[PDB]
Design a protein around this nucleic acid. Structure first.
Lengths: 99, 173, 429, 439, 331
RNA sequence: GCCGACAGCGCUCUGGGGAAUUCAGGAGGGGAAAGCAGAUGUGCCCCGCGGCGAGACUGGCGCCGGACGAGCUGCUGGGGCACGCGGGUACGCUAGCCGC
C-alpha cells in the first residue's frame, strides 16, 4: 500500500528531529413470388454450429447487432471485450486455491 | 515487472508509476518503436507519482556533483521514503528503474525492499526511461513553470565551472 | 407499485430495440442466460440513453375549435416560426427551360434541379452556393446525386451521363439507353435504372461494371421508387400493378394489384413499414408492405397525382396536378388496425404552376416542389427527423468527415446478392 | 402553436472549440442493414486478419551448428532462453538481446537431452554422459561446470520443481531421481517396481506441489507422488508418447504428445477417458507446451510445422512453417503468452508470434476497440461459408498437404472397413485412447 | 480528439438518473432538455484538449450546485429514496480526471480536498492528501492542512508523520516549523487541559534542532516567540519561552528580537493584579531595552508595532495608554 | 540583350500564357498531455485472503531454513448496517435518543 503515509517509528532515520522526537515520545390482392432465390444462399448458415441445439436458439440468438451504430457505448465495450485479458509481464502458474 | 522508475532531470527528481509495461520480448519491433516514439501512446504507459524540484541552484550543483560520481543525497532518500512503500525484501518487493548501476546498488542498500533495474543492464527500462527523456517536457509541463533548457544550461555552466575551478583563476576580462 | 412501470419500460424497450422474440430456456444454458442478460441490459440501456437526444420535433396544433391545419398560410408559418428556417422558405423563378425535376442529397445539403428542356443545376441551397449549372442542350429525363453530393448522374435523351461536383462529364453510360427513371442504392453503390423499354439495369457505381440487367415484361414503365429498408425496388406498371424487384430474381419478386389505370406515383417509408401509391383511377392507397396487406380503404385525389413522397416522419406529400397536399397520419406504425385520415394537413396552393416533382428535405422541416416555373421551397413543421446520427448521415459534414464516411461506406458496400424482402436473413439455415 | 424544428451548426461545433460534436440516434429506423453491414465488416475482418498474418519475428542470433534437441525457459524471468544442440554445446540467450548469445559452453559430447533452470539462476543439463549443473551467470564466466552426477544411468530427460530447490531426472533404468539441491549427494530413486523400459520424459506439476508426471516408451504414462515416495498410477496408451506437460492453471490436466500424430488432454485423477484429442499433425508430435495462461496450446511436429491449438478446439487454430525450418524438436512459450519459441533441426531457434495477425505494443483505444470489434464480430459470423473458407484456408507446404490428403483417404478406408466389419452404444473416440489402466 | 466518443460514455453514464428525475415529478422535461444540453457542453469542454483548472472547477461547481438544487427541490416535493451518490461519484470522476490532467494545480488539489472533506469522505480525503503531498512536497499549505486536520481528527501520531515529513521537506520558509510548534503545543495545550506531557521537550527539540537550518534567523526566531507567546496557561511555557529567550541571548545576544522578547517575556502566562505588574515589569525591561546598543530603529519599529499591538484590549490605566502613545511619539 | 528563316529536336494539344476566386486531392513542417487496457458513491463494523512489522523460539551445515507473534494496514473478495430535514443532551463543531 503506497497510499496514506504511515507514521515514522524506528526505521526511517531522516533527521535529528526524527531521532530526537521519536526518542522523547519513546521516552514518555397480392401475388408473392413464392420461389427461393439462388444468390441469397451463400449468406445462410449451412448447419447449426456446434454448441447449439435448435434453430430458434441459434437464429434467435444472433438477434442484436454488435456495433457502435446500433448499441450504446457501454454495451459495445461490454459486448466486444474479450474473455481472457492478457497483460504484459510474467504469468506464473497459480499458487493457491482461488475459492 | 517494473513498478516505478526514477527520472532525474536538471530541474529535479520525478518518479513515475509505470502501468501497462513494455513488450519485454518485442522491444525492437517497429510498432513498439512507434508506441515508444509518440506521446499519445507512451503516456498510457507512464503516470507521474511525484515531482521534487530544486529549492536552490546550490542544491542543483551538489546534486550533479553527487550524482555524477553516483552517490544519492539525503533528500533523494527523503523523496523515496515519501513515495516508495515500507518494504523489506521478506515477502513483497518493489521494482524501481534507475539509469545508474551504483545508484541502484546504493538505493537497494538504503531501502532493503526496493530492487532496482538499471538502464545500463536492461534494455526494457533503458527504453521505458528513454522516452521519458524524449517526452519529459510535455510530461512535466503541467507542474514545472518555464523551460527546462535554461535550467539545464545554467546547471551545465555551474557544473563545468565547479568541476574545473574556472573563474577563480580566469581574470582576463 | 412502480415496478409495474419498470416492466412497462421493459416492454417498450424490447419492442423498439430487442429486435427479436427472445431466446427461451447445460453449458449452452448458462451461455444463453449470459447472452440474454447482456441483450436485456443492451436494450434497456439504449432506451435509457434515448433521453440524451438534442432536438425536438416540429408540430402545429389547432389551439381553437375552428382553426384547422390545412388553412394555415405560410405567411403565418414564416412569421410564427424561427428566422433561420424562415430563411429556408424561399422560391426560385425559372420559366424558360421546362418543368424542373428536383432531388436533394441524403443529408439535404445539396439539390439538383433538372430541367426537361436541358437545364441542369447542382447547388448548396442554404448558403446559396451554386456548385454547378450546366446547360446540356437536348432534353433531360432525370437527375440524381450519387453516394455524396460530389458526383451526380443525369438521364439524358439517349444515354445516362455522370458528372463531377464541378459539372465536368466524367463518363457517358452507353449500356443504359433511354433511361426514364433512376434510383440509387446507397448502402450498395448500385445505380439502378428503368429504361423506356422496360429494362432494369443494376450497376455498381464503385467498381463500374453492370451487375444485373433484367428486362421486365410489363411493357413500358410508368413509375419507380426504392425501399430504403430492403433495397428492393418498386417499379410501377401500367396494367395497374406495383411490380416489386431485385437484382437477383429475374421474375418479379412480388407484384401487387394496386389500381386500374397506370399507377402514377410511388413512395415507401424509410422504416419500410408501409407504402403509398396512386394511379389514373384517382384513388391513392396504402399498404402494410411487410404483410402485403392493404390496410386502409383507399383515398381519392382530385387529379392523377404525378408525384408522392413521404417523409422521415409520417407526413406524406402528394403532388397532384397543380397543387400539393400533405397528409399526416396515414400509417401509424404503433397501431394494429389502421384508421382513415378524415382530413388533410398543409395544402400548398394552386396558382397556375403544375408541380412536376415534390420532395422532402431529409432532416429539415421543408418540402421542395418542382414545378414548371422552377423550384419552390415551402416549410411544413412536422416533417424531417429532429435527431440524426452523424455516424451514418451528417447534415453538417466537413471534408474530413466526407472523406472518412466515403471510405467507410466503400468498405461496407453490401453485395448485390444480399437483397431480399426480410433483410435480416443472413445467418439462417 | 406553430413550432418547426430548428438546428444551427452550434450543435456541430460549439463555437470557441474544435470538438466536432457528433450526436447520435440509436433508433433502428435510421441504421438499416444490421446483419448485412456486420456481415461485410466481418468479411473485411477475415480478409484483414489473413492479410496481416505475419507470424515470424525472427531468430536467436547465429544459431547452433547441429539441431536444437532440447531447450528451456526460466519460469521466474522471461528472457532467459537456453538451448542445447547435438554437439553437447548449450547456449544461453536473452530475449532482449537476440543478436548474440549471453553464454556458451561445449557442455557434453553426444547431445543435450535434458535442460532446465534452477530457482536461483543456475541451469542443469542431462546427456548420455550424465548430468551437469552450470552457473550461466557468473562475473568470472566459468566455462567449467560446478556440479555433476553420473550415479544413475543414461539420464534421458530432466525437470525442475517450482518453489523449493529440487529436481527430478528421467533415467534409463525406468526410474526418476529426486535431488534436493545443496544438501543431497545421491538422489532418491523412485521407479515402478518391476519396470524395464526407458522413461522418456518427466515433468513437475507447477500448481500442485508434489505430483510428478512421466511418460515411458512402454507407451505408458505414469504419475508419481512426492510426499510419500511411491508411484501413484500407470496407464498404457496405444502408441509411444514423446512428451508430457501439465496445466499451469489446472492442477490435474495433462497433455501427451504422441507418435499417434495426436495431442491427448487427460484428467489426472480419473484415467478412464481422455478430455481432448488434438489431431492436426502429419508426422509424429515432438513438443507440447501449454500456454502460461492455461488455455492455448502449441505442438511441434516431427515434420516442418508448429501447431497452435486452443484448450477446447479439437482442430488447429493456426499452423506455422518455413522452408528453412526442418524438424521442430522443441517448442515452448515465452512467459507472457504472446510469443512462441521454436527449436528445430536446422540448428536454429526462432521467435514466432502466437496470434499471427495481432501486433504488440501500446494501441490507441480506437485501434484496439477496432480489433476487439473484429474479433467479437468474427466470433459471431465466423461460420458463414465465405468467412469460414477465408479464415480456415492456410498455405501449408506441398509435402504436408499431400500427406494429410493421404491420411484423409487412408482414414476414410479404415473407417469404412470399420463400419463394414462392424456391420457383419459404440465406443467413443476419446475412450479409444486409454488402452489399460493399472492400479 | 475523440471527445464525442469519451464524452458519449460520460453522458450515457449520466442518463439513468435523468430517467429517474423525469419519472419522479421533480424536474420537468424542458428542464431536462437544458440539463442534458449543459452537461454535454461541459463534458465536451472538459474532455477538450486545451483545458484549464478553471474549467474543471466550473463543471464541479455547476454539477454540485445541481446536486443541491435537486436536494432542495426533493425537499419541496417530499420525495425520499432519491439519492445523491451518482452526483458525488460523478464529481469524484470530474476531480480524478482533473488532477490527472493538471496535477500541478493546487487550486484543483485544495478544492478536491475541500469537496472530499465536505462530503465526509475521510479515508478518500487522506488518499487524495497523500497524492497531493507527493506532487507538491515543497508546499507548506498542504503539509500544514494534512497535519492540522489529522490533529483535529485526533490521531496525533499520524499528524506527526505529516509534520515531521513536512519539516524534512519545507525548509526554506520557517512556516511549517512554526505550525509544528503551534500544533505540537496545541497538543500539549490539550494534554495539560486534560490533566511526556509533564516535560514536553518536543518543541524545544524543534527549536534546538531548528538552529541548524538554512532559515534560522533572528526575525524568524521572533516568529517562534509569536508562536509560543500564546497559550500561557500551561505547565512549562515559562520553561519553553525561557529556553527560547535564553538561547537567543546565548547565540544572537545583540538583536532587537532578543531585546523584544526581553520586554515581552513576563507577559506570557498572563491574560487581574499581575497584568499591570508584568506590564510595568515590561516597562522596566522596556526602558532597560530601548537604551541598549543594538538595532535601535528595528526595536523602535517593533515597539511601535507592539504598543499598537496592545491597543484593542480594555480595562487599562488611561495614563499608561496615553504615556505609551507619547512613547510612540518619542520614538 | 531582343528578333530570328530553313533543316533538326523536345514538350504539349476542349492551342499558349497572367490574375481573381469556388471546388477535388497529394506531400512536408510547426504547435497540442496529445494519456476511454477493462470506466462499479461514501463511511463504520464482522468474516476471508494477504502485506509491513516490534518482539520472541527452534532444526540441520559460518550460513541457510522452519514456525510464532503485540500492533498497524491493503483488498473490485463477498455478505450485514448507515447516508436526506426537526426540536433535545452538545457547538469557533456534529457525536448521540424520540420524529418528519
Amino acid at each position: 500500500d503506497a497510499s496514506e503515509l504511515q507514521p515514522i517509528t524506528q526505521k526511517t532515520s531522516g533527521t535529528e528531529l526524527e531521532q530526537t522526537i521519536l526518542a522523547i515520545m519513546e521516552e514518555s390482392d397480392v401475388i408473392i413470388n413464392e420461389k427461393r432465390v439462388k444468390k441469397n444462399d451463400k449468406y445462410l448458415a449451412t448447419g447449426l454450429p456446434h454448441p447449439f441445439e435448435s434453430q430458434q436458439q441459434y437464429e434467435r440468438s444472433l438477434r442484436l447487432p454488435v456495433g457502435p451504430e446500433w448499441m450504446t457505448k457501454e454495451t459495445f465495450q461490454d459486448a466486444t471485450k474479450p474473455r481472457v485479458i492478457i497483460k504484459q509481464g510474467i504469468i506464473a502458474p497459480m499458487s493457491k486455491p482461488m475459492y | 515487472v517494473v513498478n516505478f522508475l526514477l527520472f532525474e532531470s536538471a530541474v529535479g527528481f520525478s518518479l513515475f508509476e509505470v502501468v501497462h509495461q513494455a513488450d519485454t520480448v518485442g522491444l525492437e519491433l517497429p510498432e513498439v518503436k512507434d508506441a515508444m516514439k509518440t506521446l499519445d501512446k507512451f503516456g498510457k504507459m507512464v503516470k507521474l507519482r511525484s515531482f521534487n524540484p530544486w529549492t536552490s541552484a546550490a542544491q542543483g550543483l551538489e546534486a550533479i556533483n553527487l550524482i555524477s560520481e553516483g552517490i544519492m543525497p539525503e533528500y533523494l532518500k527523503s523523496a523515496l521514503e515519501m513515495n516508495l512503500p515500507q518494504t523489506s525484501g521478506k515477502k513483497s518487493k518493489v521494482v524501481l528503474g534507475v539509469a545508474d548501476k551504483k545508484l541502484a546498488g546504493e538505493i537497494t542498500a538504503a531501502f532493503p525492499g526496493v530492487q532496482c533495474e538499471a538502464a545500463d543492464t536492461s534494455e526494457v527500462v533503458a527504453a521505458l526511461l528513454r522516452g521519458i527523456r524524449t517526452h519529459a517536457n510535455k510530461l512535466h509541463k503541467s507542474l514545472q513553470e518555464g523551460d527546462i533548457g535554461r535550467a539545464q544550461l545554467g546547471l551545465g555552466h555551474a557544473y563545468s565551472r565547479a568541476k574545473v575551478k574556472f573563474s577563480v583563476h580566469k581574470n582576463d576580462n | 407499485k412502480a415496478e409495474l412501470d419498470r416492466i412497462r419500460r421493459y416492454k417498450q424497450a424490447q419492442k423498439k430495440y430487442g429486435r427479436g422474440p427472445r431466446v427461451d430456456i447445460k453449458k449452452l444454458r448458462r451461455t444463453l442466460t449470459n447472452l440474454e442478460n447482456k441483450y436485456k441490459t443492451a436494450a434497456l440501456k439504449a432506451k435509457e440513453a434515448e433521453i440524451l437526444l438534442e432536438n425536438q420535433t416540429g408540430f402545429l396544433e389547432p389551439e381553437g375549435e375552428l382553426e384547422r391545419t390545412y388553412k394555415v398560410r405560410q405567411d403565418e408559418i414564416v412569421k410564427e416560426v424561427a428566422v433561420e428556417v424562415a430563411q429556408k422558405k424561399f422560391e426560385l423563378k425559372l420559366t424558360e427551360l421546362g418543368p424542373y425535376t428536383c432531388e436533394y442529397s441524403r443529408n439535404g445539403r445539396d439539390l439538383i434541379l433538372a430541367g426537361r428542356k436541358g437545364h441542369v443545376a447542382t447547388m448548396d441551397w442554404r448558403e446559396g452556393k451554386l456548385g454547378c449549372e450546366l446547360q446540356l442542350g437536348e432534353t433531360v429525363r432525370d437527375a440524381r446525386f450519387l453516394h455524396n453530393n460530389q458526383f451526380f448522374a443525369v438521364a439524358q435523351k439517349k444515354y445516362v451521363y455522370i458528372y463531377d461536383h464541378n459539372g465536368v462529364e466524367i463518363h457517358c453510360l452507353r449500356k443504359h439507353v433511354e433511361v426514364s427513371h433512376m434510383e440509387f442504392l446507397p448502402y450498395h453503390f448500385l445505380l439502378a435504372t428503368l429504361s423506356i423499354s422496360g429494362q432494369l439495369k443494376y450497376q455498381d457505381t464503385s467498381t463500374g461494371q453492370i451487375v444485373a440487367e433484367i428486362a421486365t415484361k410489363h411493357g413500358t414503365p410508368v413509375s419507380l421508387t426504392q425501399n430504403p429498408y430492403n433495397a428492393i425496388l418498386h417499379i410501377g406498371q401500367q396494367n395497374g400493378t406495383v411490380t416489386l424487384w431485385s437484382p437477383n430474381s429475374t421474375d418479379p419478386l412480388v407484384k401487387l394489384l394496386a389500381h386500374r389505370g397506370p399507377v402514377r406515383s410511388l413512395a415507401v417509408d424509410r422504416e419500410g413499414r408501409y407504402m403509398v401509391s396512386t394511379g389514373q383511377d384517382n384513388k391513392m392507397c396504402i399498404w402494410d408492405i411487410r404483410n402485403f396487406k392493404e390496410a386502409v380503404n383507399s383515398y381519392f385525389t382530385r387529379a392523377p397525382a404525378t408525384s408522392v413522397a413521404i417523409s422521415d416522419t409520417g407526413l406524406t406529400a402528394v403532388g397532384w396536378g397543380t397543387h400539393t397536399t400533405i397528409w399526416k397520419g396515414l400509417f401509424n406504425k404503433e397501431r394494429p388496425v389502421q384508421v382513415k385520415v378524415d382530413s388533410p394537413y398543409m395544402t400548398w396552393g394552386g396558382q397556375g404552376q403544375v408541380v412536376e416533382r415534390v420532395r422532402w428535405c431529409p432532416f429539415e422541416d421543408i418540402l421542395g416542389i418542382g414545378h414548371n416555373e422552377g423550384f419552390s421551397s415551402i416549410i411544413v413543421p412536422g416533417a424531417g427527423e429532429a435527431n440524426y446520427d452523424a455516424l451514418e448521415v451528417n447534415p453538417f459534414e466537413t471534408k474530413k468527415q466526407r472523406q472518412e464516411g466515403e471510405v467507410k461506406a466503400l468498405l461496407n458496400k453490401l453485395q448485390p446478392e444480399m437483397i431480399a424482402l426480410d433483410p435480416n436473413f443472413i445467418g439462417n439455415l | 402553436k406553430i413550432k418547426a424544428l430548428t438546428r444551427s451548426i452550434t450543435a456541430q461545433q460549439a463555437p470557441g472549440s474544435d470538438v466536432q460534436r457528433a450526436p447520435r440516434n440509436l433508433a433502428p429506423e435510421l441504421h438499416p442493414f444490421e446483419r448485412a453491414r456486420e456481415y461485410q465488416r466481418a468479411l473485411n475482418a477475415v480478409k484483414l486478419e489473413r492479410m496481416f498474418a505475419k507470424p515470424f519475428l525472427g531468430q536467436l542470433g547465429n544459431g547452433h551448428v547441429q539441431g536444437v534437441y532440447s531447450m528451456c525457459k526460466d519460469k521466474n524471468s522471461l528472457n532467459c532462453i537456453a538451448s542445447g544442440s547435438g554437439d553437447g554445446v548449450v547456449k544461453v540467450w536473452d530475449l532482449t538481446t537476440r543478436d548474440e548469445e549471453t553464454w556458451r559452453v561445449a557442455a557434453h559430447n553426444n547431445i543435450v537431452k535434458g535442460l532446465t533452470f534452477t530457482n536461483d539462476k543456475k541451469l542443469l543439463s542431462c546427456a548420455t554422459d550424465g548430468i551437469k549443473l552450470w552457473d550461466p551467470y557468473a562475473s568470472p564466466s566459468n566455462t567449467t561446470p560446478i556440479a555433476t552426477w553420473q550415479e544413475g544411468g543414461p539420464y534421458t530427460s530432466l525437470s525442475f520443481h517450482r518453489s523449493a530447490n529440487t529436481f527430478a531426472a528421467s533415467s534409463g533404468q525406468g526410474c526418476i531421481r529426486i535431488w534436493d539441491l545443496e544438501h543431497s549427494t545421491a538422489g532418491q530413486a523412485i521407479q515402478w517396481p518391476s519396470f524395464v523400459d526407458t522413461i522418456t520424459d518427466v515433468c513437475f506439476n507447477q500448481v500442485e506441489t508434489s505430483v510428478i508426471g512421466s511418460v515411458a516408451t512402454d507407451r505408458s504414462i505414469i504419475l508419481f507422488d512426492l510426499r510419500t515416495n511411491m508411484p501413484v498410477i500407470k496407464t498404457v496408451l496405444h502408441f509411444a508418447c514423446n512428451r508430457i506437460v501439465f496445466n499451469p492453471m489446472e492442477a490435474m490436466n495433462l497433455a501427451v504428445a504422441s507418435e499417434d500424430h495426436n495431442i491427448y488432454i487427460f484428467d489426472a485423477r480419473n484415467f478412464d477417458k481422455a478430455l481432448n484429442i488434438q489431431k492436426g499433425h502429419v508426422a509424429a508430435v515432438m513438443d507440447v507446451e501449454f500456454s502460461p495462461t492455461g488455455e492455448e496450446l502449441v505442438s511441434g511436429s516431427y515434420d516442418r510445422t508448429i501447431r497452435l491449438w486452443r484448450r477446447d478446439a479439437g482442430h488447429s487454430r493456426d499452423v506455422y512453417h518455413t522452408k528453412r525450418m526442418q524438424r521442430v524438436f522443441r517448442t515452448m512459450w515465452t512467459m507472457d503468452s504472446k510469443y512462441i519459441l521454436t527449436g528445430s533441426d536446422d540448428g536454429n531457434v526462432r521467435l514466432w508470434r502466437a496470434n499471427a495477425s495481432e501486433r504488440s505494443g501500446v494501441k490507441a483505444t480506437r485501434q484496439r476497440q477496432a480489433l476487439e470489434y473484429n474479433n467479437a464480430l468474427l466470433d459471431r459470423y465466423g461460420h458463414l461459408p465465405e468467412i469460414r473458407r477465408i479464415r480456415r484456408h492456410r498455405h501449408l507446404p506441398k509435402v504436408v498437404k499431400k500427406a494429410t490428403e493421404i491420411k484423409r483417404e487412408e482414414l476414410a478406408a479404415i473407417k469404412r472397413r470399420e463400419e463394414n466389419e462392424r456391420k457383419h452404444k459404440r465406443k467413443s473416440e476419446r475412450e479409444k485412447a486409454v488402452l489399460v489402466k493399472q492400479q | 480528439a475523440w471527445v464525442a466518443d469519451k464524452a458519449r460514455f460520460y453522458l450515457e453514464r449520466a442518463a439513468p438518473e435523468l430517467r429517474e428525475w423525469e419519472e419522479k415529478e421533480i424536474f420537468t422535461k424542458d428542464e431536462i432538455r437544458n440539463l442534458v444540453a449543459k452537461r454535454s457542453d461541459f463534458e465536451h469542454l472538459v474532455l477538450a484538449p486545451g483545458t484549464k483548472p478553471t474549467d474543471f472547477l466550473n463543471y464541479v461547481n455547476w454539477e454540485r450546485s445541481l446536486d443541491r438544487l435537486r436536494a432542495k427541490r426533493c425537499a419541496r416535493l417530499n420525495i425520499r429514496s432519491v439519492t445523491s451518490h451518482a452526483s458525488q461519484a460523478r464529481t469524484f470522476g470530474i476531480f480524478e480526471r482533473a488532477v490527472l490532467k493538471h496535477p500541478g494545480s493546487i487550486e484543483l488539489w485544495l478544492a478536491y480536498l475541500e469537496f472530499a472533506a465536505q462530503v465526509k469522505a475521510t479515508k478518500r480525503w487522506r488518499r487524495i492528501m497523500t497524492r497531493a503531498l507527493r506532487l507538491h512536497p515543497m508546499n507548506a499549505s498542504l503539509w500544514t492542512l494534512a497535519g492540522r486536520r489529522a490533529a483535529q481528527n485526533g490521531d496525533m501520531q499520524r499528524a506527526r508523520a505529516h509534520f515531521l515529513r513536512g519539516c524534512r521537506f519545507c525548509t526554506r520558509e520557517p512556516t511549517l516549523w512554526l505550525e509544528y510548534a503551534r500544533c505540537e503545543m496545541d497538543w500539549l495545550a490539550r494534554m495539560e487541559a486534560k490533566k511526556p506531557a509533564l516535560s514536553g521537550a518536543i518543541p524545544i527539540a524543534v527549536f534546538d534542532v531548528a538552529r541548524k537550518q538554512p532559515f534560522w534567523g533572528p526575525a524568524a526566531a521572533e516568529k517562534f516567540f509569536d508562536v509560543f507567546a500564546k497559550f500561557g496557561h500551561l505547565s512549562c511555557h515559562e520553561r519553553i519561552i525561557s529556553h527560547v529567550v535564553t538561547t537567543m541571548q546565548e547565540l544572537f545576544p545583540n538583536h532587537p528580537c532578543t531585546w523584544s522578547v526581553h520586554i515581552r517575556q513576563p507577559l506570557v502566562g498572563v491574560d487581574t493584579p499581575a497584568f499591570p505588574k508584568a506590564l510595568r515589569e515590561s516597562l522596566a525591561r522596556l526602558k532597560a531595552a530601548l537604551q541598549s546598543t543594538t538595532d535601535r530603529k528595528a526595536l523602535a519599529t517593533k515597539m511601535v508595532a507592539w504598543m499598537d499591538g496592545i491597543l484593542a484590549i480594555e480595562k487599562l490605566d488611561a495614563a499608561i495608554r496615553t504615556v505609551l502613545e507619547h512613547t510612540k511619539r518619542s520614538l
